[PDB]
Amino acid sequence: MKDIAIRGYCDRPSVATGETIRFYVSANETRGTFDAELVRLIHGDSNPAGPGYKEEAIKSDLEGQYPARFQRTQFGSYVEVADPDAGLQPDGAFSVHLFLWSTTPSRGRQGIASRWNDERQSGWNLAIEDGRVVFTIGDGSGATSSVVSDRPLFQQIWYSITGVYDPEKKQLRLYQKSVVNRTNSRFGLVVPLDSDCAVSADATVKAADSETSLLIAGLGEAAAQDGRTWCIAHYNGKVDAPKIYGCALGQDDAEKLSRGEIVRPISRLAHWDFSAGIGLNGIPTDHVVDASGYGHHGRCMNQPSRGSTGWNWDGHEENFIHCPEQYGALWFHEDCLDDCRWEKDFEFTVPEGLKSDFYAVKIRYEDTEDYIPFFVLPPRGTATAPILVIASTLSYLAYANEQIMHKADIGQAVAGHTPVLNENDVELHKNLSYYGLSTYDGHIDGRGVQYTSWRRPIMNLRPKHRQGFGSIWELPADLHLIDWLNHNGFEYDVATEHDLNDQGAELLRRYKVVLTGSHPEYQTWANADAWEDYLADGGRGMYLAANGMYWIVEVHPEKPWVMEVRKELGVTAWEAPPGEYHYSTNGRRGGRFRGRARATQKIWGTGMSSFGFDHSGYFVQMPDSQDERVAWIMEGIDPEERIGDGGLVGGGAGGYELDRYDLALGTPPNTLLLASSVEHSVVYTVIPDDKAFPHPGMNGGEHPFVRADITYFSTANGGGMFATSSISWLGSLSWNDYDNNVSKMTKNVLNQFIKDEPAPRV
Amino acid sequence: MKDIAIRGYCDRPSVATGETIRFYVSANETRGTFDAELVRLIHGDSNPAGPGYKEEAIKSDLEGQYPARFQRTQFGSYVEVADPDAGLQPDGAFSVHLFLWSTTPSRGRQGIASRWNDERQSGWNLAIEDGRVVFTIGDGSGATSSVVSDRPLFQQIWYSITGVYDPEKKQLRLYQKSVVNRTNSRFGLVVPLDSDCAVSADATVKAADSETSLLIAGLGEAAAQDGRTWCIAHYNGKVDAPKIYGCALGQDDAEKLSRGEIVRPISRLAHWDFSAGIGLNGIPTDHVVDASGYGHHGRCMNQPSRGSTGWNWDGHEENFIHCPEQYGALWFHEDCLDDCRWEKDFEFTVPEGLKSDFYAVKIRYEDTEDYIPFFVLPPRGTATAPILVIASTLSYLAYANEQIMHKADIGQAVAGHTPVLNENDVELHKNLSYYGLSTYDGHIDGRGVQYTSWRRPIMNLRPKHRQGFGSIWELPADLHLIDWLNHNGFEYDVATEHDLNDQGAELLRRYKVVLTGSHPEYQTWANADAWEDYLADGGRGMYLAANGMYWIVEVHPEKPWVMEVRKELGVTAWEAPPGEYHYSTNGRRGGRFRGRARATQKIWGTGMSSFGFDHSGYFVQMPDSQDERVAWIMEGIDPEERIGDGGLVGGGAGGYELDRYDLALGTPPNTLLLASSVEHSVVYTVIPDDKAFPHPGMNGGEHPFVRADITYFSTANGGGMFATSSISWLGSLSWNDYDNNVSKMTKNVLNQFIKDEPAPRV
Amino acid sequence: QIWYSITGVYDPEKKQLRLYQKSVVNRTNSRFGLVVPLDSDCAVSADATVKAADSETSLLIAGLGEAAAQDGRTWCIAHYNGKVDAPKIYGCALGQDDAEKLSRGEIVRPISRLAHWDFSAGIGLNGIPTDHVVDASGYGHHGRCMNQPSRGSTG
Amino acid sequence: CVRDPSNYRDRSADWYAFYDERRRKEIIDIIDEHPEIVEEHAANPFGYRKHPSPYLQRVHNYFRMQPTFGRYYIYSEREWDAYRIATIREFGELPELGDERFKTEEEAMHAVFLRRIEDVRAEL
Amino acid sequence: CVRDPSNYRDRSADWYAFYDERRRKEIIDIIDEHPEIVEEHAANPFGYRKHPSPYLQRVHNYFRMQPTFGRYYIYSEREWDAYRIATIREFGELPELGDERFKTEEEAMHAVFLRRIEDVRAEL
Ligand SMILES: [Fe+3]
Ligand SMILES: [Fe+3]
């Protein structure tokens, strides 16, 4: 069909004046040129019942023609130990020990530990071939020598594997031993497992210098060109404590290494401890320490999961910062990606007279037309507007390259209909290697994706994209608010949640009112602190969304383009495995905000109540609508009207996500309840956070928790928070050509908050 | 109507031969006598479709007439500081400071801290009256002097409260100050809270020796008779760091005390640190340490919740053993009971030739008949039979004095019918002070009950009790199995789960086969270790039940009759507050076994899948039933028949709790799936642990997880494990006068497991 | 032997070399303490007439490069004496607000860093027995100790 | 300034009254549009081997989740001989029993069902 | 003695087959006993302001929770102008598109519903 022929991304989400942003572009093949120009995004939704797509051209130094070329992506987690001087290719006898835990032991050939060239079969490796651990040496002639284990591995069982090369006997040996205990494996000690072997073979050849790096969980593709080794046969599952010896080990040495004893410490050529670097702040680094004392330090590539349960993990401690000796594993999936690592094609330095708004680079290739969005800040330390719009870039990363309808069996069940998918949803399915996975997707192992990255082509971030749950989801849903603010005469600035994480409440206090996106679901702990500190002293805000502070996020300290989330039972897609709840960026718990005594009620007045994606409802006015203290809100609205019966997103104003009033979760006591939503269906459900025992009938129309709630409270020093508690509020702003109750209410509150008089103090 | 006139408990659940059990009986009023005699429990269910009630009298030295009397029960949590020398009634100036966190601040008069006599109004106290903190002294002539706060207390807000008595100005003073932070209280920092006040009043009287003990969270009733002080005006909510001074404090000093600074350390008279004693194994003690060097050590009474979040808790650490300085609180519910502390009426020493079985002491008062069930063991180190029946006494404590149908609003919705309730539930509803609460109950605060005790009259432990979900629930549901074993020729011993906790796998290895109860839901960690050590080495077991290893329990070491469970999301009645998931008896996580990588599939083959209580289903055979390796199980059973269509519990053999085969949770690889249950209704639901997103249709007959699964696997050394995966299995053994498929299958597996040959090795 | 926080800024938009100096003494880190009324804070600027070029040397902490690197080896001539803590290079121009936040140890603008060498990255329970200096910005610009500087020094 | 907690109340009660009014009107409309669910529940009130209709189940889903102050239940006066309908009161009180006795608990369940329909009609 | 993992398998598939058989028979019995739910779905496949019947919702609850390999969806060939019906394949594979084109997406949803009913009738 209309296939995607050009891809691209930018290196950073937001850029102030006088700063450089770099744009990395890739084509299907190296031919032709492509065009590029700068646009200002105004509206994104191409629904014929609305305004249609809107953009504006901007003259810049950025535009021109550039050569189109294919750029290759490395895809899959591994550890790369750079060995320039062939020290880890030993000249005589050498032994390799490691602990293993395989999740897909029959998914092709999977290299475990290797200094191995695979173009010419030179070096040594340790790999899984047809479910069996194989230890192979070679010398580049094509002639190799292997030893194959008698016992095929089981899935998710800890094994202790030793490979031995011995020239004195001209012999390859292999030791295998399962080290199951009560908690570390898939099944426990009641199973009479027999997976111990000790096999030998005749090494007719000698191992040669492979001219590659050493790789944990992979094999090297060819000889290194310009110092880069390419990884090919990716392993899935935990590796714990690998080490290389300069001698040949016996069976008593293998038996002692299976119990965790370090035998012959003077003979270790290398020993990588994956738990070295854990303090009370976690392990926020890609650095892998050589514990032998020879400086063969490694580097984690494409972010394998650190702080993972080891081979000796009994469950007496479930926090990896208090028992680092039982957390020496790294998970290593084959479909991870933290950086595409492409070569830059062009870059942009922001001029002085460039307004702070949403921007995109429009790349015009042969028939494919691609966008690359970015965000432009005001000059550093200054504000150029009274209104601040927060772009929800952390939630853009959470839903980045989302593949629910192609992967999740409950995709159509959460929706209330069959999904409608673009060619972008076909392009993600056809080329998974170019893009990666979302945090709502899982790996090929089964565990969900914790880490997501900005430095990759994110295809559901383009403004002409329409998502599968309904109409539109993340950035075109914020272009609704942008188009409403441009149709009226409001002057605004744009910040991101990464900028909020960097700058604190000092960013927010430059503005009289701060607005959120349509779905600001993922926040850091410092963003919640900044919002609370802003509102506690005269700050005003509008929360024009639902599901607004649900999951705790930490931005990675060494790599600020990578986001971490670990999830638990709640409104979730996956659940974290039992001892692995704590983040590795900071050493803290970080599940739901509500489970850390920081529910969304304690800051924004309302918080997560229900979800469902068939259609939307409308709001019905509560008795606080006729209160004299909120006559400024309900100003041009008859007291018997439906608020928001019609809209682009879902067909109404109350829908897709609902937040409610709750004093026990932390609503301020002076909050008024202006309206509440009705006409919700069986597809909407009560969230698992609110259930004790699941009984029948906890769904829309049949349970009191299924509602959205328009609220308002006031804070000290003339501040106040307004909330509408629905995603599809912003999709109802441009209904009936901007002549509706939704835009009247939002405009009344926004004209009140941009004044100099205090917020009206309910 | 029919009121209960006589009660009773025993000191310990299980007693071996040559050992002593004490009995504690209370009548409604002191008049007359009562009779007592020993019986053997055989069958408890009085359903006319079944065998009817059965028992057997035993001649013993226990029987006779005993004087009836009313025994008063102290009910509610408090800390008691014994002061015979009146050291904590000072003669001159004194001040009191504490941190306050009140859950029901407008519920009666609640004594916070006191050394107070309430008959004659003597001493001093600090109490909540009319929602306001009042500090009152009194001389013992009816004349009191008070000082009342200007600001009422908000609900679940942390306060810093100083009460000062200054004789130099003849002035009672009081200081109140809220100490909220981002995480410790009900609402957060955006609320412009104004509950700070400094008030004063004239003091006309002097405080006198109240001749009571000092009490945290309560007032003393009268003068101490025989050394025992009674507590009347019980507080609800957290108290943190109480201290008494020998001087008069100013507003500067109270302001420094609100920041946690210990002002004037030489002037302290007492200072109780509620976090003194937290090691790496929790705080398993009632001793409260005086941190002022004066030896005024305290004592917890009726088990207040140790390990509670304190006034300065920010959620960076959520385990009290790693940050003990932010966990200095106790919760102090007004409806806790760890021991009724009655007087012994009669005792019993188990004779030399008494069989190990279920026993009870039948008490025969005027028109009322109460039983006191206990358990008789074989002699220490010997086993008198090849069968061990485990009585599920931990699960009996969990459901002890269950009041779901009177308190929980969703109690009928979890069932599928209107509950039928006896006079015992009416007696629990009428006299709450005598009996206590279950762990499926919440407190009056709303937070669920974490501690349950054996030394109290447990009314649903009696065999003639019928329960609200259906027919019968815990001990008559095990009398089903006892009646089936006595009807056939099988010879068994009886042990409890407390004995299994004490004795390990050394208890289990004296037997050929061990049988579980009908619902062995609450287990300790060591019991799961004992079962895994028994099955891993030649042991045989039958799991004639479901929901069998769900929650982690710890028995209190200093008080072996008290059980602890803290709960999370899942199949729960309540969830623990955000910083308090770790037990106080040992400092370990311990919620669901499934979240600790110790699911029920790893040991017993099947694990918790579904629940619902309207009626039961029948089983349909699977293609492993026609296998030649398990033809001994399906011996006299036609391969076209239903298994268990009809029965006393629900009308079928698959019902009320369903367990399934699941390899990912840890089912052994050589497990055969023999049969599965059908005909479940919309009442039966999928558990929250198997849900990612709630969608419509996760109930019986619309989802694959709603099934029971009869399984069998074999272990090493001739062992094996049989599983029926349903509560209502034992209710179907006595159907059609013991002539049905359920009893035939159970008799086949039990005749195989008592032979000397190994298990048939699937 | 007084601890200072030093930011050198090259701003082409104003054609301006800037420099920020600020003493960060506490009760224990320096030669004298907090009773000394120290005044060594300054913010100066100068015009920049030239642009910086590729020196064709390695980067050096505590020294200057002598000539262009011959056979890959860079020689060091103007040797510094004393402690250096947390050196970092940015891709933008910093203000006085940013240098003031950097003096408190806050890592301002983490996405704009070009390199950041953490001299304490690698301390386990067995010391730091290595010459490898870790780039804590994610760009792989890893360092190397030469002639054994004292690792484990007070910061 | 927030200084007195009696000046503040739970404002979700104002929506619970609205929701309960809508929901009672809905349940009496379902009972009037489908009168055979009453005789269906009279035949088999447990749903044993004949599961309830979805409209009967929707009526059950309204009735079973109500707050327990004022909730009907069945009191076993004599087990398998006599059954009475009881009303839940505060802690420390006896239930308010009905005058009519029943033989089987299925008859008591259908009588509770009919009395709940009579109460939800009498409130409108 | 457990030594080779190819000797073992997931024996819950023997019950998933048994469950799918009963479940497909129940779904075609619902569609035969209530023919009006197909026209109910054709009038409004979103249930916008007219929520679906319990029998139509039971048919939806069967169709929507299937495994994704083989599942039907709608491919927006030209948005608001043309819609086709696709079938999900493995990773790396383009989907198999349908022949017929549709104007609105509600027509495509009802054609997916009809084609799923045809495919569940074809296996029996
Ligand atoms: Fe979400
Ligand atoms: Fe239970």
Residue numbers in the entry:
A (entry chain A), B (entry chain C): 1 to 762
C (entry chain E): 156 to 310
D (entry chain D), E (entry chain B): 8 to 131
Paper text:
We show that DMFase from Paracoccus sp. strain DMF is a halophilic and thermostable enzyme comprising a multimeric complex of the α2β2 or (α2β2)2 type. The active site consists of a mononuclear iron coordinated by two Tyr side‐chain phenolates and one carboxylate from Glu.
Subsequent 2D classification showed that the smaller unit was a dimer, and the larger structure was a dimer of dimers. We noted that the salt concentration in the buffer shifts the oligomer (dimer/tetramer) equilibrium. In the presence of low salt, the enzyme is predominantly in the dimeric form, and this equilibrium shifted to the tetramer at higher salt concentrations (≥200 mm). The high quality of the maps allowed de novo tracing of polypeptide chains of both the large and small subunits. We used the dimer map for the initial tracing, and the final model is shown in Figure 2 B. The model from the dimer was used to obtain the tetramer model. The mononuclear Fe atom is tetra‐coordinated with the protein. It is coordinated to two phenolates of tyrosine residues (Y399 and Y440 serve as monodentate ligands), and a glutamic acid carboxylate side chain (E521 serves as a bidentate ligand).
